[PDB]
Ligand SMILES: CCNC(=O)Nc1cc(C)on1
Ligand SMILES: CCNC(=O)Nc1cc(C)on1
Ligand SMILES: [Zn+2]
Ligand SMILES: [Zn+2]
């Protein structure tokens with residue numbers, strides 16, 4: 030059962046204030062038909078406009094919360110709100126646009142979805158808390174049919190133009206007027222008691238109710254993110270590569286080895302406490318240090334409390350040596366720590382808005398991360414950039430400008446002139462470092478960390 034059967038029942042109780050008299054007995058087949066669409070017994074990749082919770086999770090990058098509020102409904106204006114923060118007024122004659130006819134509103138909808146989604150997904154999934162008007166407004170901006178490809182590329186078609194009678198993906202849709210073969214999911218079908226605001230406000234204080242359609246669209250998508258990624262965590266779902274995923278992950282491994290290796294050399298801790306990932310391997314396998322592991326899955330709701338991770342009777346002394354928290358989000362890091370913490374506020378194609386300040390970081394897997402909080406790092410300082418290498422000065426095997434840098438911690442820089450090998454490795458490491466920081470990761474270290482202590486490791 031790959032797709033959602035059209036003959037599945039759809040609960041219509043949430044629809045009856047906007048649509049009084051709505052039949053209690055309803056299927057997706059009958060609902061799509063009443064929304065003014067015709068599926069025509071077509072076996073061409075679009076079996077249902079509506080999708081399962083499982084299909085929505087795999088297409089989280091395509092999620093766009095959508096709500097429609099009656100301003101005054103064929104005779105009255107409609108306020109269309111999207112989780113992008115946009116509000117458009119459609120007339121049948123927190124950005125707020127004045128009343129305009131459907132023929133111009135639909136051009137704006139195609140532009141907005143195309144700009145938001147071209148670098149995220151091959152589709153759109155309208156996330157709803159369906160009350161009626163949003164479903165009956167879809168016939169004014171949506172066209173359906175067989176699965177098609179773009180007129181200018183191989184990507185699947187997401188838009189249609191009535192002017193040219195052609196189809197386009199999100200990348201080539203300038204001037205297009207119809208959303209083609211969108212997907213949608215009604216959060217109210219999952220079984221909730223009470224309205225949208227009461228269910229959303231149970232888990233989130235960051236999204237308020239300013240009483241506009243875009244606030245509801247935002248609350249709806251936030252509630253769906255909470256249900257599918259915060260309280261239910263699935264690390265077996267893989268997601269496509271849409272950017273610098275591989276470079277970011279390779280950089281993260283390079284930076285971790287570099288920072289931990291230099292902390293061990295500079296301060297000679299007798300024991301390292303590695304807290305986090307139950308499948309972690311020693312990042313510095315040749316280090317002398319006693320390596321002790323403590324399992325903690327990535328927290329997706331609230332940050333771990335250091336009192337619960339550490340106190341309940343382990344070397345016992347976490348105060349001895351150093352603590353390594355590589356993406357293990359805690360409320361307050363101990364002073365003897367090496368930390369990598371993802372900054373949820375970062376703007377990127379990998380980082381989607383999350384629940385209660387948190388963010389949904391999608392890189393191979395989906396990781397809902399609790400809100401970045403500066404007070405967690407009060408016992409530490411920001412880790413400054415440095416490159417450290419004790420490998421021999423030898424080239425082996427891209428042109429050159431002599432490198433001059435106070436942060437290239439090598440025997441050759443100590444001796445006055447950086448060798449070509451360490452200059453090539455430094456620049457590669459600096460590129461990897463900048464990639465990781467720009468992806469949203471932040472590095473923190475114990476206050477006594479000083480790179481001046483690495484120079485005497487060459488004697
Ligand atoms: C689902 C779309 N339905 C409508 O637009 N109208 C109505 C009216 C009644 C009654 O049931 N559906
Ligand atoms: C428990 C350590 N975290 C992970 O294993 N992975 C993560 C967490 C974030 C954020 O990004 N990757
Ligand atoms: Zn295209
Ligand atoms: Zn929220």
Ligand SMILES: [Zn+2]
Nearest residue numbers: 422441448451
């Ligand atoms: Zn060198």
